[PDB]
Each structure stands twice: as structure tokens, then as C-alpha cells.
Ligand binder design. Structure first.
Ligand SMILES: *[C@@H]1O[C@H](CO[C@@H]2O[C@@H](C)[C@@H](O)[C@@H](O)[C@@H]2O)[C@@H](O[C@@H]2O[C@H](CO)[C@@H](O)[C@H](O)[C@H]2NC(C)=O)[C@H](O)[C@H]1NC(C)=O
Ligand SMILES: *[C@@H]1O[C@H](CO)[C@@H](O[C@@H]2O[C@H](CO)[C@@H](O)[C@H](O)[C@H]2NC(C)=O)[C@H](O)[C@H]1NC(C)=O
Ligand SMILES: *[C@@H]1O[C@H](CO)[C@@H](O[C@@H]2O[C@H](CO)[C@@H](O)[C@H](O)[C@H]2NC(C)=O)[C@H](O)[C@H]1NC(C)=O
Ligand SMILES: *[C@@H]1O[C@H](CO)[C@@H](O[C@@H]2O[C@H](CO)[C@@H](O)[C@H](O)[C@H]2NC(C)=O)[C@H](O)[C@H]1NC(C)=O
Ligand SMILES: *[C@@H]1O[C@H](CO)[C@@H](O[C@@H]2O[C@H](CO)[C@@H](O)[C@H](O)[C@H]2NC(C)=O)[C@H](O)[C@H]1NC(C)=O
Ligand SMILES: *[C@@H]1O[C@H](CO)[C@@H](O)[C@H](O)[C@H]1NC(C)=O
Ligand SMILES: [Ca+2]
Ligand SMILES: [Ca+2]
Ligand SMILES: [Ca+2]
Ligand SMILES: [Ca+2]
Lengths: 385, 386
């Protein structure tokens, strides 16, 4: 059927602020008796009125049927703008969303979730494994616990993507590995480390992912030192698919800085709020654009205080890639529960004292955090405040 | 083993006018020698320079090896743009193409085929039955009969597809069928009847098939009346796979029109140039979007002057589907013989008088014509020049 950007509750085509074209959802909606509504407040923080200002509202289970290619992986995005739609209190909305037998959301309150994030809108993004079916059935089910619950949706995107997931190294364990090839994933965070926001229009692979500056997630007292590649520095992908990440991710990084003695005394630390009781994959993106040789910059990486790369196998970007300007990533997996970090993921970097490196520093170019499904479920609870 | 769109002779990723992404063919070329070439001339009829303006040229045999799932059916497309490449005379190009054990093309002249069609480029499309092999070997062999014979290719696509083929009713016989489930097929024609061209980007199943307007193929004096479903009319597929055809096929149709007297005195007639000595499957796509009951519109269907639906079993779309808005298709098979049939398939419809229907009309929403393989061969001769 091909990729779609549906603005729910619209009757004509529309375009957003980033030159993405959207179309009405009506075509794809199997079930009747939905309500369409336009919000009566346009939050000044919205980047566009599209798709956010218009919604479709469901008071019974409702299914969209989107033609897809069965053998392919897809990105699915759900856009929500909890605002005022004439005649409803958005606080009453609690619902489930499923996509071909994968549960995405359950008892989901967009209002509570937005309040907790201090953001007026939400985009939930998922990477769905191939389901061998030529229709993606997206079912919205109002809560059967609350008589007054309704479901709503402002936009849906379905985007074919390559098989960009394979194995991840298990954090804190010696050489253990797990397969992500058939996993369903939720995108939790996607950062351009040390660099400016990259809008979807500048993403690679036609995937229109947004990559956010990482500064708001730095937990260490030190912000470190951001690095920028020289003008027209060439990112040499070699055999890495360009869809993994756009070149600009690799042209900037965050490092600890030029003072190796100070760097040895601290970790550069990021912290993220996530849902308990899931395995997460952290994809760390690297590209050395300053140094040229093995054993110049060699560093330990820790996830939730456990070893990701350390001891006699620390991280060395040139050690991994063989050459300045080659991009790469490494995937690490951690099951996060009460004993392992609770509701938080921490990522920490510090120089290694193995093999007498030329410098004592660390760096990172990009970061993605994905939730893996457990028994075809990705739904977590709503956040607190 | 993913789907591929290879633009042969390129060294950078490219994209065409319909946003299809293409990549270089280099990694998949397994045996032989070849060079990249760029066409000297951009024909104004080309929608894109991708993949058509670049080619790989073979002066001896060469093979691609493409990873596939052996238990799955595939679409294979071969793109050709005859032009002057590396100083060679395109009129000397005659070659064979094989995909595993299936001969697709033999003594193939892209130049002559293009001249006969009044088209500057060709896309040959095949549906290959499961191979039980994890590699698709695509072999290009220059003709060993002409001395300066060479082969060329501009683009290759390999696309995993569902099993969209089963049995077809043999025309002019009753309860005799042809089995296409494990056949290798060539796509000859694919039409949105009564509607505008549907580009591959809008095709269902992610199969990127183009559905072309049918008007050029009508040979009755009357072109009938084209119909379009109302705004927000929904096509209700039920258990028919959406990969069969996109919704827009079913939202338009060609009919004979509102004058039943005129309709009763004529056939709506399509004609197609094909290759003799093959069995063809005609897939007729239907969806009733105006009427609502059985025995409102009831019509006879003839293929090569023989009965496909007639007598006491004429076509009735609601009769078949049970409801307005439910799409369907019916497959019919016909052998086109070396004398009778004579390089053409004709499809004709006219109203039936059987059972006193409310109206006297006929309609059709889409049409596909497939060649079935014989002796593991789908190759036909080059058409006559004019
Ligand atoms: C296509 O098939 C014909 C044979 O067709 C069969 O035999 C015929 C004699 C007739 O009985 C048909 O109805 C049968 O289906 C191949 O042979 C040619 O056939 C034509 C007449 O149809 C005849 O004029 C030629 O002399 C025959 N040729 C030879 C070499 O004997 C023909 O070669 C086949 N073509 C292809 C491209 O495979
Ligand atoms: C950098 O962070 C790592 C990981 O959190 C620190 O190592 C941990 O230190 C605590 C003690 O404070 C121990 O309980 C853990 O066992 C350590 N983990 C590992 C994997 O060794 C490390 O000390 C920090 N370094 C600095 C300089 O702050
Ligand atoms: C559905 O979601 C809300 C989450 O916000 C749940 O209600 C909250 O539950 C927690 C206790 O875990 C309290 O701290 C909050 O005060 C509750 N908030 C509100 C607004 O009621 C609710 O329990 C969930 N329901 C189900 C069936 O899971
Ligand atoms: C519509 O076309 C059909 C099929 O070509 C016509 O039926 C044929 O008529 C010719 C001449 O009368 C015969 O040689 C064929 O044997 C007929 N075939 C069949 C299957 O009946 C039919 O006459 C045409 N209808 C109209 C209304 O013109
Ligand atoms: C290969 O194809 C060419 C072109 O179709 C064939 O040559 C034509 O043969 C027919 C006779 O069947 C004549 O009508 C044309 O004048 C010929 N055209 C040219 C350009 O020569 C040729 O016979 C075929 N060769 C083989 C071995 O099958
Ligand atoms: C997490 O898992 C533990 C252990 O299975 C369980 O006791 C707890 O209820 C779960 N908590 C959440 C928030 O899912
Ligand atoms: Ca909307
Ligand atoms: Ca960066
Ligand atoms: Ca090409
Ligand atoms: Ca049509």
C-alpha cells in the first residue's frame, strides 16, 4: 500500500512545518461511528497544526487496516495532542492500542503522560517485526474499566524500514548476546550526542526520524566538551547501511575533554526515565573524526553501573573501525527491574587504564534507546506527576 | 535476502520520479566481466533517468546471484533502455536471460521491441514460482549467432510476493481448469479499467506494480462510460487479500452505459498483442459500487470469441460477491494457438438477457493478463518492426 502519514479527523490533504505531506485517515478506518474533532486551543509550543489540531475519537473498539508488505519491518508512529475537543475532558481518556497482536499501549493516558513530560504533544514510535500479513490492523480499545473512557488519535504514520536490528551484547555478562532481529521495539530516546537537533526531513533512509540534542539528559556535574568534525569531513559508511543514522550524527560528539587527569576522576553520565520490567537496547553511535590510530582514545562504558565495555576490552573507536571517519554502532542490552536500576537507565563513560593510551578521554556521537517486547507487549504504566 | 532494486551501471544510490530507491548492482554480479555505460541520449518520454540512463554491458555471459527465500514466490523485473552504449550499435544486441532454470528472454532485441511498441523503454515483469533455492541466478547470455551480439541491462528488481495465483477456468469448457499455483508467469498487461494510471508507489502489497489506464486497448467503436465510486466509498475486501489489487482499481470501472438498447447491440471490446503458443490467464477484477442487488446488471463475457461467462451462468457482480463494495476477481485461461487466436487476445462483454435483469449493461474494474510458462520457457519472438 506504501508508506502513509494519516492526519486523523481531517477531510483534505495537509502539510506540516517540515514539508511532510499528510492525508485523511478516513480511507483506512474499518469501523464506523467515530467522532472527528478539532482542538479548541492551539498550544504555542506546537511545531505545526498538522496532524495535532485534529483528532479522531472512539467510544467502542475501532480498527484501522493499513496495507503493508508482509515480509518487511515497519516504523509505526502514533501522534497525540491531549487538548480540548468540544464536549470532552481529555482526562477521561484511557485506552489500549494493538498492532497485529503486539500490544503497544494499555490504560494509556495522553494527558497524564504529557503533564509528566511538560510537553503539549506526544509521538509514540515503534519498530514492528514482520508479521507475514499484507494488512497492519491497528486497534484502539477504550478501557473496559471506566464506563466514560474513550480512545483518541491525532496522526498515524506507517513507514517501511530495513532490518536494522541484529544482536546486542548483554550488559554485565561475559560475551553473552541476544537476538533483536524478530523483536518488536519501542523507540524511547534518539539523540544526536554533542550536536543540534536533526529534523525528520534531514534523516537518512527516508525514515524521517528526529534526533535530539543530548544535553537535557546529562546527569554528571560536567557537561563535557562537544566536538565538531572539520568542514566537509567525509563520513565513510563503507558497508554500513546509510539508514542506520544520517551523516550529521557522526560529525559531532560529546567527550569528557582535554584534561586526562580530571577525566580519570569522573564519568560522563546520561540518565533516562524508562518503564520497569523490560529489556532495553542501547545503540551507541561512534565515529572518530579527530584521532587516527588505535590506542589513542580508549574508554570504559557502563550501563546501570554494570560493564558494557571495560576491563581488557574497553572501547576504542579506531580499534573497532580501523580508520578515522568510519561510522559504527554497538548495541548493548539490559533487563531493567527493581534490582537493576528501577525506572532509570544510566549510561557512563570514563577513560580506561588498560594498555597505556595516548589520551585519557571518552566520546560518543549518537544514542538510541529501544524497549524490546516481552510476550508481544510494549505497554508500560503512565508516569506520575 | 531482502527486496532489491538495482540500477545497473551506477556507483551511488539513486531514486526515481515515483520515489523508489535504487542501489548499484555491483555486489550481486557473480561471474563474467562487464563495464558501466551511460546512454548518449535522454528520450523525452522517460519519466526518470533512474534506472534507464545507466547500463551494464555484457559481451560474454554473466550471472547475478541474488539471495532469496526458496519457499517464496518472487516478482522479477528487468528494465531496458535501448541506446548507444560505449560506441556499440544497439541493433546488434540479441541475448538470452534465464532465472534459475526458467528462460525469460531468448534472441531478445530491445531495440526492435521498443520500435514496435512506440515506447523508448521496456519493463519485463515475471512472477517466479518457489525455487527451493536460497539464490536466484540471473544469467545474461549474448547471442552466439550474431558476431557483435551483446547483452545489456539497466535495472533489476527482485521482490518477494504472496502466492496470488491459483486455478483459472479454461475458456469455452466447463469444470476444466489450469493450475497456476506453481507456474512461472510473465505479466503481459495490467490495467486499471475506467481509471487513471496507478503508480507503483500507490500499489497494494508493497509490490509497486503500475496499473495503466485501459483506453488504449479498446477496439469497439464505443468506449462505453467510465464510472467512479462516490467520495469516501469504502472497498470491503473481506477475506480477499489486499495484495491482489489496490483499492483504487475497484473504485473505478468501464461500463457500456445507461442506454440498454445500444448496449444490447454491441460488445465492449479490448484487444491485446501477445505471443502465440502459450496459455494465458486473464484476471478480471470486479467491484459493484453503484448497484446493490442481484440481477440488476448481468452480462456475458467472451475471450477470443469463446464463452467465459454466458448462457445460464452470465456474470453478475453482486451475484458473485453478495454486496455492493466487495471486490473480487475471476481468472480465465486460454491457449493461443499457432493458427487460431493469431497473436491477439480479445476480451468482450455485452449484456445478458437471461433472467430478465433490471438493466442491460456490463462493467469491469481491472484487468491483468499473464503468460504461463511452457517447457520452462516464457520467451517469445521479437515483434514485427512497424
Ligand atoms: C508454435 O506451435 C506450432 C505448432 O502448432 C501445432 O501444430 C500445428 C501444425 C497446428 O496443428 C497447431 O494447431 C498446433 O498447435 C509450431 O509449428 C508451426 O506451426 C505452424 C502452423 O500452426 C506451421 O505453419 C509451421 O510450419 C510449424 N513449424 C514447424 C517448424 O513445423 C511452431 O514452431 C511453434 N512456434 C514457436 C515459436 O514455438
Ligand atoms: C564510573 O562509573 C562506574 C559505574 O557506575 C563506577 O564503577 C562502579 O563503582 C561503584 C562504587 O561507587 C561499584 O559499586 C560498582 O561495582 C562499580 N562498577 C563497575 C562496573 O566497576 C566507577 O567507579 C565510576 N568512576 C568514577 C571515577 O566515578
Ligand atoms: C490506569 O492509569 C492510571 C495511571 O495514571 C492509574 O491511576 C493511578 O494509579 C496510581 C496508583 O498506582 C495513583 O498513584 C494515581 O493517583 C492514579 N491516578 C488516577 C488519575 O487515578 C490506574 O490505576 C490505571 N488503571 C488500571 C486498571 O491499570
Ligand atoms: C459480442 O461478441 C461475441 C463474441 O465474439 C459475439 O458472438 C460471436 O458472434 C460471431 C458472429 O455472430 C460468431 O462467429 C461467434 O461464434 C460468436 N461467439 C459466441 C461465443 O457466441 C456476439 O455476437 C457479439 N455480441 C454483440 C451484441 O455484438
Ligand atoms: C532473432 O530475432 C530477429 C529479429 O526479430 C530475427 O530476424 C527477423 O526474422 C524474421 C523472420 O522470422 C524477419 O521478418 C525479419 O526481417 C528479421 N529481422 C532482422 C532484423 O533480421 C531472427 O531470425 C531471430 N533469430 C533467431 C536465431 O531466432
Ligand atoms: C515488575 O516485575 C516484578 C517481578 O516480576 C513484579 O513484582 C512487579 O509487579 C512488576 N512491576 C511493574 C511496574 O511492572
Ligand atoms: Ca489530525
Ligand atoms: Ca553527534
Ligand atoms: Ca541503470
Ligand atoms: Ca478501475
Amino acid at each position: 500500500g506504501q508508506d502513509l502519514a494519516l492526519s486523523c479527523g481531517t477531510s483534505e490533504a495537509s502539510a506540516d512545518q517540515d514539508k511532510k505531506k499528510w492525508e485523511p485517515d478516513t480511507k483506512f478506518l474499518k469501523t464506523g461511528n467515530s467522532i472527528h474533532a478539532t482542538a479548541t486551543y492551539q498550544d504555542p509550543s506546537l511545531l505545526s497544526t498538522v496532524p495535532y489540531m485534529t483528532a479522531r475519537i472512539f467510544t467502542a473498539p475501532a480498527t484501522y487496516e493499513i496495507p503493508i508488505k508482509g515480509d518487511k519491518r515497519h516504523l509505526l508512529r502514533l501522534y497525540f495532542y491531549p487538548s480540548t475537543y468540544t464536549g470532552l475532558n481529555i482526562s477521561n481518556s484511557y485506552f489500549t492500542v494493538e498492532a497485529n497482536d503486539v500490544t503497544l499501549l494499555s490504560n494509556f493516558s495522553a494527558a497524564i503522560t504529557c503533564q509528566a513530560l511538560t510537553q503539549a504533544y506526544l509521538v509514540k514510535e515503534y519498530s514492528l517485526a514482520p508479521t507475514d500479513k499484507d494488512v497492519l490492523s491497528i486497534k484502539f480499545t477504550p478501557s473496559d474499566k471506566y464506563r466514560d473512557a474513550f480512545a483518541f488519535i491525532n496522526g498515524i504514520e506507517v513507514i517501511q524500514m530495513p532490518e536494522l536490528f541484529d544482536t546486542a551484547a548483554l550488559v554485565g555478562f561475559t560475551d553473552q548476546t541476544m537476538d533483536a532481529k524478530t523483536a518488536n521495539l519501542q523507540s524511547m530516546f534518539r539523540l544526536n550526542v554533542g550536536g543540534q537537533d536533526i529534523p525528520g526531513s534531514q534523516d537518512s533512509g527516508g525514515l524521517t526520524r528526529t534526533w535530539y540534542n543530548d544535553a537535557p539528559y546529562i546527569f554528571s556535574a560536567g557537561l563535557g566538551v562537544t566536538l565538531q568534525a572539520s568542514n566537509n569531513f567525509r563520513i565513510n559508511y563503507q558497508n554500513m547501511p546509510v539508514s542506520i543514522a544520517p551523516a550529521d550524527i557522526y560529525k559531532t560528539a560529546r567527550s569528557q575533554g582535554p584534561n586526562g587527569d580530571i577525566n580519570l576522576k569522573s564519568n560522563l553520565t546520561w540518565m533516562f526515565q524508562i518503564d520497569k520490567n523490560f529489556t532495553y537496547i542501547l545503540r551507541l553511535h561512534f565515529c572518530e573524526f579527530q584521532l587516527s590510530k588505535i590506542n589513542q582514545k580508549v574508554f570504559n562504558i557502563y550501563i546501570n553501573n554494570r560493564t558494557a565495555q571495560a576491563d581488557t576490552t574497553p572501547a576504542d573507536i579506531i580499534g573497532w573501525t580501523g580508520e578515522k571517519g568510519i561510522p559504527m554502532y554497538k548495541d548493548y542490552a539490559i533487563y531493567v527491574d527493581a534490582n537493576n536500576g528501577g525506572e532509570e537507565i544510566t549510561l557512563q563513560m570514563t577513560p580506561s587504564t588498560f594498555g597505556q593510551p595516548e589520551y585519557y578521554d571518552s566520546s560518543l556521537n549518537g544514542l538510541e534507546i529501544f524497549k524490546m517486547d516481552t510476550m508481544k507487549n510494549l505497554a508500560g504504566p503512565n508516569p506520575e506527576p
